[PDB]
Amino acid sequence: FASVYAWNRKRISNCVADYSVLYNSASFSTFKCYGVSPTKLNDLCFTNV
Amino acid sequence: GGNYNYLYRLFRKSNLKPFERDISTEIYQAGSTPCNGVKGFNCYFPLQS
Numbered sequence: 001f002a003s004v005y006a007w008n009r010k011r012i013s014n015c016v017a018d019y020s021v022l023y024n025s026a027s028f029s030t031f032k033c034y035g036v037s038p039t040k041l042n043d044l045c046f047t048n049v
Numbered sequence: 050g051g052n053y054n055y056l057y058r059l060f061r062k063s064n065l066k067p068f069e070r071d072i073s074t075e076i077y078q079a080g081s082t083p084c085n086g087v088k089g090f091n092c093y094f095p096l097q098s
Contacts, residue, residue, distance in 0.1 A: 024081050026090050 012049035018042075053098035060095040 002008045019041045023031070031038070060077040076084045080091025088094070 024091075026082070 013047070017049070056096045056098055058095045059097060060093060 019038070022028075023038055036044070058071070060079065061071075062077070065071065074094070074096055076086065076088055076092050077095050078084050078091070079093055082089070082091040084092035
């Protein structure tokens, strides 16, 4: 991974993304969602990530 | 110093019927991992100040 003043920025578009597998992973120390509840990402969706 | 006697519930299984009050303070199975009375991971207390 890169540094904090040179953080890596990635664009995601035109694919199906399964957030359930990441949400069920226990290796993440912190998993905080502010705008929306983590449960309902698989229902609503946007045009870019 | 910050008062914390004022609580609100953020996690619930479903919505509320009109004119209904719920005071059930029980751990919520946020993720696929069962809680079994222990928060651990993927379980959080519904109420916070």
